[PDB]
Amino acid sequence: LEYSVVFNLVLWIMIGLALAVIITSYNIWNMDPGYDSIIYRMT
Amino acid sequence: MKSIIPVVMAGIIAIYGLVVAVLIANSLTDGITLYRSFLQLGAGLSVGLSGLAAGFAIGIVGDAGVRGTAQQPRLFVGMILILIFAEVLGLYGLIVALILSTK
Amino acid sequence: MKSIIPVVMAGIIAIYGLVVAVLIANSLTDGITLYRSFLQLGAGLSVGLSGLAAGFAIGIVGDAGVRGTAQQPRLFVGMILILIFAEVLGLYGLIVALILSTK
Amino acid sequence: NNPEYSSFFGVMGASSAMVFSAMGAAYGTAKSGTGIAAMSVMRPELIMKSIIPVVMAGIIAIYGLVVAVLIANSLTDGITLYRSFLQLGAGLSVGLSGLAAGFAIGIVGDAGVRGTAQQPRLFVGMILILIFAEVLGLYGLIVALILSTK
Amino acid sequence: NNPEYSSFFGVMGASSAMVFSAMGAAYGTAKSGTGIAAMSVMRPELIMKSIIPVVMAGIIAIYGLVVAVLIANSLTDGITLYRSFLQLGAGLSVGLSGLAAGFAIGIVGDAGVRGTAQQPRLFVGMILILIFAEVLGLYGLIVALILSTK
Amino acid sequence: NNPEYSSFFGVMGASSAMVFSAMGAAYGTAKSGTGIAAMSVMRPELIMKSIIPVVMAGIIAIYGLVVAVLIANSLTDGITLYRSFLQLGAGLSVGLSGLAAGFAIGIVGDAGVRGTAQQPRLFVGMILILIFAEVLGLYGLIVALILSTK
Amino acid sequence: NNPEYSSFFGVMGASSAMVFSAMGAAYGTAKSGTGIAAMSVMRPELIMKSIIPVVMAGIIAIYGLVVAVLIANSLTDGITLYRSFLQLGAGLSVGLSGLAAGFAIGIVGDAGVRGTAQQPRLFVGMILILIFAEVLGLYGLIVALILSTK
Amino acid sequence: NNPEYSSFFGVMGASSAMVFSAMGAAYGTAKSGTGIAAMSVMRPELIMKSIIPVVMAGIIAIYGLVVAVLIANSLTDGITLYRSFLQLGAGLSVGLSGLAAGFAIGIVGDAGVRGTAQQPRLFVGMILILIFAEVLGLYGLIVALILSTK
Amino acid sequence: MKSIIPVVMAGIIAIYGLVVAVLIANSLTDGITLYRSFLQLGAGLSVGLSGL
Amino acid sequence: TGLELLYLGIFVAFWACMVVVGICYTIFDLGFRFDVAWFLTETSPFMWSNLGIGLAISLSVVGAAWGIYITGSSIIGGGVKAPRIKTKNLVSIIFCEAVAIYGIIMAIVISNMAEPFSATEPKAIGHRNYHAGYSMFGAGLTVGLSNLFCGVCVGIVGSGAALADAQNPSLFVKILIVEIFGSAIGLFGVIVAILQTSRVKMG
Amino acid sequence: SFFPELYFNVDNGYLEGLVRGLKAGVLSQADYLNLVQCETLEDLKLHLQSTDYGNFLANEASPLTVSVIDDKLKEKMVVEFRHMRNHAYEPLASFLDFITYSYMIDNVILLITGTLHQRSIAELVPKCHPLGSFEQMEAVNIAQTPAELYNAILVDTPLAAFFQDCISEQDLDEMNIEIIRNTLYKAYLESFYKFCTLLGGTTADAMCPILEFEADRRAFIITINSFGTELSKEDRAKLFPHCGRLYPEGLAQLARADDYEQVKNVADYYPEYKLLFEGAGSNPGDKTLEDRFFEHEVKLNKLAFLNQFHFGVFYAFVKLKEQECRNIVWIAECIAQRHRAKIDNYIPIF
Amino acid sequence: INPAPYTVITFPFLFAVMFGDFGHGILMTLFAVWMVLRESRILSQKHENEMFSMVFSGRYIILLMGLFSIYTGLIYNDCFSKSLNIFGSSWSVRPMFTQGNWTEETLLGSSVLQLNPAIPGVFGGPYPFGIDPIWNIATNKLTFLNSFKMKMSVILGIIHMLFGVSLSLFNHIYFKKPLNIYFGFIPEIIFMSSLFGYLVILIFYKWTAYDAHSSRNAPSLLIHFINMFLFSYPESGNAMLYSGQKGIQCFLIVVAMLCVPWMLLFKPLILRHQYLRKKFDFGDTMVHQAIHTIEYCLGCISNTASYLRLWALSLAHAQLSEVLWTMVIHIGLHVRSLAGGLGLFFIFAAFATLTV
Amino acid sequence: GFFSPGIWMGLLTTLFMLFIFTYGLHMILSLKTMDRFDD
């Protein structure tokens, strides 16, 4: 009974956590170590 | 020879991936009260994303530190020292995973 | 040696996450009244997000202050101050988590 | 008699109030601190002058703490689904107000720090502009406190 | 008779009212601070003048706060689902109008501040476009005040 | 009898009739106006020659508006719900075809700006290309008229 | 016997036909026309020789219109609910096939315009390629002529 | 027993077939025409030995239409929900196969044409690529016809 | 001439999918067990993605 | 540039989920669980009235603001050396506040008819009000977006006009004609709105 | 596409207004004729004072020479360019950074050859063309060591990306400085074209044709002058930027060209350069080919001003105004030597 | 004070608890002894492998590591995931378990496990050393073992950092800094003790004051600690350890709070007072002491939490060894007589390689 | 069924609110600092 409300709540929480983890993953993926100092020497 | 240092330690993330995975591949059954099942889901995703965290940090930091060791040999000590915390993080993941796999 | 403090701060944020994590884990059962369990969920989200903010701040500021102190030594103390501020953010999150763990 | 799952929205309010302001402070301090590390390196005579955005981000974090703790300590099981929604609205309100305030103070603080590197006259007006964003956060806190005790 | 879930529309309205107007005020402060920081190095004698759009962005925040506090006062539990709907519409409308007015104020502010940096003759015109933007913000306030009683 | 809510299809018929068509109209006018502002800078004698795309963007607006007025005249409460399907289809058709003709006349128009700016001879040709686009707009109109009165 | 909403599919069929074909013709006049405005600056003598792709886009418009009106006059209230599917599929097919010949013509004509500018011998092939594009238009019309009457 | 959505699915099969085939052929003709327009200037004489990939995109269109019209002619109302499955699968398979084939034809034709602008011997290997483009098209055709007979 | 090897090979990649698809068509029927249709879908999408 | 990637991912996931659910429902022949009457009969016309008003004012506000800053940036850029620009180009900002009033007055037109129902059972109760408040919604969003794009076009055209007026102010009216056209399109929007709100009645 | 015409104004309205105003402030052919009606340098100063130019020789030496007016024009260019650049944002700032690299290359060429032959850095500092900056340390006071300046170029100087192809100081000593600058110039054009194509809007439409023509021009004249000098044909072809209509075909015939008429035949296939070569009669006492090229570039700059939503306007006024400065200089030279019979040897700026 | 002599013994003990195994300790003591017996030969021999040189230079470090590793392997009662049986597992009498109302329990036991109950009145008794091997085979070992391992790690960390804080006093005594004693060591050590010593004695008090007669609605350590920290004192819901404890906890919290002002501002205020008497930036020195207080307090809390790495790595080793036993040497045991041993040969070869 | 009718309009209102909010957030993320100053 009232399975709809449970379905809505679980969907919302799951997508929210998915959004947070995915945006954090995208963030940490594209870090820039600087591309300078000795990195100049290594290009 | 120094090139191998961060990679042997990178293997520990995979070791941890086996730690709970094999444990639960052995301890699984059919007549489950459906709540321990949830606990195991939580443990697995926790240790896994901790593996992601340790992998990210180890890759980038071992990279940068081994550049700075290829230039300055003194940097080696700090390279190892900073490397410590990545496996500390993976350890924290495995801690919570074992607690949930046994609670 | 003087440049390792922010790494220790990252470790402390790992402490902030892990203490609440294990506190939620060991405070578990199957027949819960659905109230405290929900509170544990909210506490976990709060402490995790606070720890993530602390991680971002500590990484960025540690890099900036490390590259700064080498040129101008007068920036080292201010770097340390901002590290304290990041720890205080983590502690804010920890405070609300502990309040929600026993409400 | 009360609706089920009623009290949950207020707790999500506390969590949002906390986390959004935490993001705001974590950003307001970070870019300002990079500004300090880039400016003070060659004019270190203004180290003590340019800590104001950091204290302001701290104030935003304190607003987040006080609202979150106030909501967390008012919780119960017997809510009529009408207190929880108000607590949710208050929490989201103050949290994102602190978030926007944090962004504003961080960018303005970096800009003003570099500007007073070039021109000492800015300092007081810079502080005034910082007061503006802090008072925006204060407005958000006003509405949140009116809703929390409602 | 009273429909269930009747209370969440209007509180979210008041939220949106103070939220989006706060975003607009943040926009104004953000852009005008970058302005003043860029400017006073060359001509430090016009700092007091460049606070013109900043106070006005604060006034946009006041518009949003006024509506939000009004709706906060007027809420209740025994709603026939009508008043909460009026509150929702009024609040969201004033919020988005504050957002628009604030952004316009901000970027017009930085631009006209530059125009004053070079040509002093553009300063009165800068105030002109700012007053028109503030009239827009005041429309945003006034129509929402009408809606909360319609 | 008439199923309830049946008029909704027709009212979106009116909306979708005019909305996208007017998007296109004001896009074409907008962009041709900027190109012709550049023209106004570089030579003034072809200003009578520059009014061409704008009036035809107006024609696109008419293509939308006539259908929209037809629907808004045929509106009522007890609609059979089988004419309203035609009303909705006609609306979305004429609207987006007005959008089609709109950006088409726009891009061809500002191409023609520079084309006639350097060579007065290409004026006739670019008018021909323009006329094709309003033939497309009339296409967008006629099926809408057929369906809305079928 | 046939349920409500049975007539619905056919009108979107006719619509989508004319919609997508209008998009195709709009893009045909889009790219090639601007190519003319860029090319004919230095070769105004070929003003009459490159109208062919534009009229070809017009022909795509004709195809769309013909199928659209064909469905418009063949629809009814008491439809079997299969003819509605046939008309929907036919209209979708021919419309986006018009769109297909549309971007094919646009790109090919834009290339052929300045290709004729540099080497006038390219005219022998350009209209042949445009004929291939219009063959694809005919392909769409063929499928539309089979499905609608089916 | 026999549903109407079975006929719907078969019609969408034939549609998607010719749809995606037209997409591929139009894209192939576009890229090929750009390639010819690039090569034609320095090599005016090979305008008659360059239409080949356009004809072969035509062949992909042959495949798309023969399957589409074949499925269209087999449509009926008394479908046991099985031949509808076969028709839908056949149509979508041949369609996207033609899409991929035309994409390959466009890219390889443009690249080979640009290579042949100075290398007449590349013509042979270019045909060698073209044959496998048609192999992909044929593989789009094969199973689709098999399903149309199943 | 010699450079044509990867293109013949690309054709072979499409052979891998086409032949199996014809096999599915051979084994396809209206009255299927709801368990052979399953294996047909599994095999088909698997070989397709491997070929991609 | 990750924000547009996020939006594209959101849209793709939403559309794919809708398609999958629809084909599954058609496959299993579910008994009108996708009940349109359920989606619609449970819709309060107060939505229709209130959101019509809100969109009508909001979109007008947004477009008028857009024209305001576009003209502001352009005039401020052009007045660096040609300050005579401000003699003329303020008519554009007047047109922006005209873009505002076109929506505000029609918001009042809709708001005059705010009334209650005192009806609970959807079937055959308030048949007229159902179409009336809806139509208020349709007209409101129509006039809103109408004034919106009208303000957008007027603004960017006024930008072009100002940057042309920098070097020669004599051609300003020759450029202002196209702003008049844009105003005419906005008026078309207002007229469709009044035709959509002239045969409605609430409660 | 829809991406342009919306975001551009939001962050470049003021700069577009300023650059359009400075464009409107150019000197017409009437102003040039008025200046030509001077017969003296003092009257030239007065004619400059009748416009926004002039009024700069006040508080200076009474006698007037070419160098004074050249320095004043250059200083005005530098002041306005720096003033505009300072008030900019990153999408435009990268553009202006490319515009500055076009002279960074010349300055780095100047700096080297003052170390292979031991010369002070500070004495070269004023010699550097303005807009040079080089406010970064460790390029100053290199102890006259080629390794030191090479490391300073790789580290501090933003040209390290281009210097990833000119390395190890082996090219620095063995191979001719002119070819070093030519190779770096080609690489810089390639990078600039790629960055422009990344911004696929009105900016791409404005700057792709101009750079295309510029590269094709350079390859043509490279082949023109290479005949009389010692140069491997491959070493000539490697200096042709690939961002031109010549690269798909035409560069090769230039690579194997041997005389002026063969280069003419290569240009014949392209009418856009056929007209420029035909107008370039090379007669004794008429305009020359590079004058035709300058006219082409100037009219393309004027064409660029017809659109409002491109960053190209800034590059356009820079080129047009330095061309105006060159015209002023040439008229000054004609006045000074009393060769008024050659006053009509300057390209107008419309 | 040189910390090396104290490290000589601290560090082996911490590495032993971090490597808490008997057999592995034996193997790596054998390695270290092989280094030491081959001292002279290795000394007169070039070894370009710098890893070998670095491990060899601290070879006696490795000897200490391994000695303490063996000792902890004995106390933890583990040796390749196996407990040592001195046959002293005298706690649970099984025939008496049958006597304890468990009649024909095996009939149900053919599908269930039937955990032994607490205090049947007939059980009781410790094990001679370490843990009883019955827990080595139990399923509740995870709940039973890991908990006191956690608490143990807390205890050890507290004692170690106590020792460090005493070393700071010894520095103060040597260098004649009475300010670093009155406002320094004394206030901060009482600050730390007034929380953590109370925690320790509470832990031991519960361990020796509550048994399974009071298991039902027994107290909880963490709940009581939270009650202390938050000044919450519910009447019921948590069995009270002893009467009047609320006032004692309040006093302890109050003195912990009263310890802050000393290091906070009493020393710099005295510096300013003495300086003014003699007549030095007050603000800078005040900030220095502020960061000193912050770093001390936050370091204390973070260290007290981070000593659970002890527990973490101990569990990690224990579970790794158990898995290695359950997967590798477990499958080598089979009913088959000869083929079983032949397979066991290579199975244990792989076992040994992976173990080392 | 699949949904509780008492909260569908609420869901739609939340969707519109988050749409306008993500518009605002997309706008505020385009902000950025100022580079070196003019004199």
Show the 3-state SS of chain B: CHHHHHHHHHHHHHHHHHHHHHHHHHHCCCCCCCCHHHHHHHHHHHHHHHHHHHHHHHHHHHHHHHHHHHHCCCHHHHHHHHHHHHHHHHHHHHHHHHHHHHC
Q: E92 and J97: CB-CB below 8 Å? A: no
Closest CA to E17 of J58, D11, D8, D18: J58
Written as one letter, the residue type at L143 is: T
Q: Are C9 and C86 in contact (CB under 8 A)?
A: yes
Distance CA C50, CA C53 (A): 5
Chain H, residues 22-41, CB within 8 A of chain G, namely 22-23, 25-27, 29-34, 36-38, 40-41
User: In chain F, what's the furthest Cα-to-Cα distance?
Assistant: 66
Q: Are D69 and D116 in contact (CB under 8 A)?
A: no
Distance CA C18, CA B89 (A): 10
Contact partners of I by the rule of 3+ C-beta pairs under 8 A? Answer: H
How close A26 comes to chain D (CA, Å)? 17
Contacts with E107 from chain K: Cβ below 8 Å: 10
J135-J139-J145 Cα angle (round to 5): 145
Q: Are K121 and K114 in contact (CB under 8 A)?
A: yes
Distance CA L261, CA K313 (A): 66
Contact partners of G by the rule of 3+ C-beta pairs under 8 A? Answer: F, H, K
L136-L13-C11 Cα angle (round to 5): 90
CA F132 to each of CA D147, F53, F126, G5, L58: distance values in angstroms, whole numbers, following the listed order: 61, 12, 10, 36, 90
Written as one letter, the residue type at K15 is: L
Catalogue the long-range contacts made by K118-127 (C-beta closer than 8 Å, 24 or more residues apart): K118/K144, K119/K144
Structural domain for B9, as ranges: 1-103
- Enter the tokens of residue K167: 């390395």
Q: Are F15 and F75 in contact (CB under 8 A)?
A: no
L with F: touching (≥3 Cβ pairs within 8 Å):
no
Distance CA K276, CA M9 (A): 70
How close J28 comes to chain K (CA, Å)? 42
**Residue whose pair of structure tokens reads 């025994």 in the numeric block:** E78
How close J155 comes to chain E (CA, Å)? 12
Distance CA K92, CA K87 (A): 10
At a CB cut-off of 8 Å and minimum separation 6, what does J117 contact?
A: J45, J126, J129, J203
**Residue whose pair of structure tokens reads 């109230």 in the numeric block:** C35
Q: F69 and J175: CB-CB below 8 Å? A: no
HSE-up of residue E84 (Cα within 13 Å, Cβ side): 24
Q: Are G97 and G136 in contact (CB under 8 A)?
A: yes
Closest CA to L59 of L82, L91, L37, L78: L37
Burial D70-80, CB ≥16 within 10 A → b, else e? bbbebbeeebe
Query: For C103, which DSSP code?
Result: -
Distance CA I6, CA I13 (A): 10
Q: Are F21 and F95 in contact (CB under 8 A)?
A: yes
Percent helix, strand and coil across chain J, each rounded to 5? Answer: 80, 0, 20
Q: Are H139 and H96 in contact (CB under 8 A)?
A: no
Breaks (C-N over 2.5 A) in chain C follow: none
Q: Are K108 and K160 in contact (CB under 8 A)?
A: no
- Enter the tokens of residue L352: 């040994």
Q: C45 and D7: CB-CB below 8 Å? A: no
Q: F41 and J167: CB-CB below 8 Å? A: yes
Contacts with C3 from chain B: Cβ below 8 Å: 78
Contacts with M1 from chain A: Cβ below 8 Å: 4
At a CB cut-off of 8 Å and minimum separation 6, what does K234 contact?
A: K255
- Enter the tokens of residue L245: 């404890």
What burial class does residue C8 get, using C-beta atoms within 10 Å of its C-beta: 0-12 exposed, 13-18 middle, 19+ buried?
middle
Q: Which of D96, D143, D149, D150 to mutate to test the interface with E (most CBs of E within 10 A)?
A: D143
- Enter the tokens of residue L262: 């000393």
Contacts with K270 from chain H: Cβ below 8 Å: 41
Written as one letter, the residue type at D25 is: A
Q: Are E7 and D85 in contact (CB under 8 A)?
A: yes
Distance CA K130, CA K140 (A): 16
How close E42 comes to chain J (CA, Å)? 16
Cα J9–chain centre separation: 26
Selecting from A25, A28, A42 the residue whose C-beta is nearest the C-beta of B67 gives A42
Selecting from J3, J35, J43 the residue whose C-beta is nearest the C-beta of M26 gives J3
Q: J43 and M9: CB-CB below 8 Å? A: yes
Selecting from J77, J159, J162 the residue whose C-beta is nearest the C-beta of K18 gives J77
Distance CA E148, CA E9 (A): 13
Distance CA K274, CA K271 (A): 4
What burial class does residue L161 get, using C-beta atoms within 10 Å of its C-beta: 0-12 exposed, 13-18 middle, 19+ buried?
middle
**Residue whose pair of structure tokens reads 């939403």 in the numeric block:** J14
Measured from the Cβ of residue J27, the count of other Cβ atoms closer than 10 Å reads 9
Q: Which residue of K has its CA nearest to H111?
A: K248
- Contact with chain I for residue H55, Cβ under 8 A: no
F119-F123-F124 Cα angle (round to 5): 130
Distance CA G10, CA G14 (A): 6
Burial K127-145, CB ≥16 within 10 A → b, else e? ebebbbebeeeebeebeee
Distance CA E66, CA E61 (A): 9
Instruction: Please tell me whether residue E13 adopts helix, strand or coil conformation.
Output: helix
Selecting from H124, H132, H150 the residue whose C-beta is nearest the C-beta of I10 gives H132
Q: Are M11 and K60 in contact (CB under 8 A)?
A: no
How close M26 comes to chain A (CA, Å)? 14
J124: left (phi over 0), alpha (psi -120 to 50) or beta: left
Identify the H or E element spanning H124: helix H122-149
Identify the H or E element spanning L78: none
Resolution in angstroms comes to 4.3
Distance CA J81, CA K25 (A): 9
Selecting from D85, D115, D140 the residue whose C-beta is nearest the C-beta of E7 gives D85
Written as one letter, the residue type at C79 is: M
Q: Are K128 and K107 in contact (CB under 8 A)?
A: yes
Q: Are J107 and J58 in contact (CB under 8 A)?
A: no
Handedness of CA F103, F106, F109, F110 (dihedral sign): negative
Handedness of CA F76, F82, F83, F85 (dihedral sign): positive
**Residue whose pair of structure tokens reads 């109760």 in the numeric block:** J125
Distance CA D89, CA D144 (A): 8
Instruction: Please tell me whether residue K119 adopts helix, strand or coil conformation.
Output: coil
Measured from the Cβ of residue L146, the count of other Cβ atoms closer than 10 Å reads 20
Cα K128–chain centre separation: 15
- Contact with chain K for residue M27, Cβ under 8 A: no
Q: Are H112 and H31 in contact (CB under 8 A)?
A: no
Query: For F45, which DSSP code?
Result: G
- Contact with chain D for residue A1, Cβ under 8 A: no
Selecting from D107, D115, D118 the residue whose C-beta is nearest the C-beta of M31 gives D107
- Contact with chain K for residue H42, Cβ under 8 A: yes
K with M: touching (≥3 Cβ pairs within 8 Å):
yes
Counting every residue, how long is chain B? 103
Q: C25 and B99: CB-CB below 8 Å? A: yes
C34: left (phi over 0), alpha (psi -120 to 50) or beta: left
How close I30 comes to chain H (CA, Å)? 6
Q: C65 and D22: CB-CB below 8 Å? A: no
Distance CA D56, CA D72 (A): 24
Q: Are E90 and E145 in contact (CB under 8 A)?
A: yes
Handedness of CA L70, L76, L80, L84 (dihedral sign): positive
L227-L229-L235 Cα angle (round to 5): 20
At a CB cut-off of 8 Å and minimum separation 6, what does L29 contact?
A: L63, L66, L67, L69, L70
How close L224 comes to chain B (CA, Å)? 21
Distance CA J45, CA F8 (A): 12
Query: For G119, which DSSP code?
Result: -
Distance CA K325, CA F83 (A): 73
What burial class does residue L219 get, using C-beta atoms within 10 Å of its C-beta: 0-12 exposed, 13-18 middle, 19+ buried?
middle
Q: How was this structure determined?
A: cryo-EM
Closest CA to E126 of E107, E142, E100, E139: E107
**Residue whose pair of structure tokens reads 């007589």 in the numeric block:** L337
Query: For E51, which DSSP code?
Result: G
Selecting from F25, F57, F68 the residue whose C-beta is nearest the C-beta of J192 gives F68
Distance CA G11, CA G72 (A): 7
At a CB cut-off of 8 Å and minimum separation 6, what does K68 contact?
A: K57, K60, K61
Measured from the Cβ of residue G149, the count of other Cβ atoms closer than 10 Å reads 11
| Helix F52-74 / helix F8-42 crossing angle, nearest 10 deg | 170
Selecting from B82, B85, B99 the residue whose C-beta is nearest the C-beta of C26 gives B99
Distance CA L331, CA L333 (A): 5
Contact partners of H by the rule of 3+ C-beta pairs under 8 A? Answer: G, I, K
What burial class does residue D5 get, using C-beta atoms within 10 Å of its C-beta: 0-12 exposed, 13-18 middle, 19+ buried?
middle
- Enter the tokens of residue K134: 């080089």
Number of domain units in chain G = 1
Contacts with K272 from chain G: Cβ below 8 Å: 42
Contact partners of J by the rule of 3+ C-beta pairs under 8 A? Answer: E, F, K, M
| Helix G8-39 / helix F83-118 crossing angle, nearest 10 deg | 0
User: In chain M, what's the furthest Cα-to-Cα distance?
Assistant: 70
Written as one letter, the residue type at E132 is: F
Burial L99-121, CB ≥16 within 10 A → b, else e? ebebeeeeeeeeeeeeebeeebe
End-to-end CA distance of chain B: 43
Q: Are D28 and C59 in contact (CB under 8 A)?
A: no
Query: For K286, which DSSP code?
Result: S
Q: Which residue of D has its CA nearest to A2?
A: D4
Closest CA to H18 of H8, H30, H29, H26: H26
Identify the H or E element spanning M8: helix M8-29
- Enter the tokens of residue J176: 């202002």
CA K303 to each of CA A9, F19, K299, K321, L241: distance values in angstroms, whole numbers, following the listed order: 60, 36, 6, 15, 91
Closest CA to K47 of K62, K69, K67: K69
Q: F34 and J159: CB-CB below 8 Å? A: yes
Contact partners of C by the rule of 3+ C-beta pairs under 8 A? Answer: B, D, L
Closest CA to B100 of B25, B24, B15, B11: B24
- Enter the tokens of residue B67: 């550049």
Helices (H), G40-122: 52-73, 83-118
At a CB cut-off of 8 Å and minimum separation 6, what does H41 contact?
A: G115, G118, G119, K269, K270
Query: For L86, which DSSP code?
Result: -
Contacts with D14 from chain C: Cβ below 8 Å: 42, 46, 96, 100
Q: Which of F5, F147, F149 to mutate to test the interface with G (most CBs of G within 10 A)?
A: F147
Measured from the Cβ of residue J32, the count of other Cβ atoms closer than 10 Å reads 9
- Enter the tokens of residue J3: 């924000």
Distance CA L40, CA L44 (A): 6
- Contact with chain B for residue C14, Cβ under 8 A: yes
Distance CA K68, CA K54 (A): 12
How close G67 comes to chain H (CA, Å)? 15
Measured from the Cβ of residue K231, the count of other Cβ atoms closer than 10 Å reads 15
Q: Which residue of F has its CA nearest to K303?
A: F114
Written as one letter, the residue type at J168 is: N
Contacts with G42 from chain K: Cβ below 8 Å: 271-272
Distance CA K315, CA K304 (A): 10
How close H144 comes to chain I (CA, Å)? 10
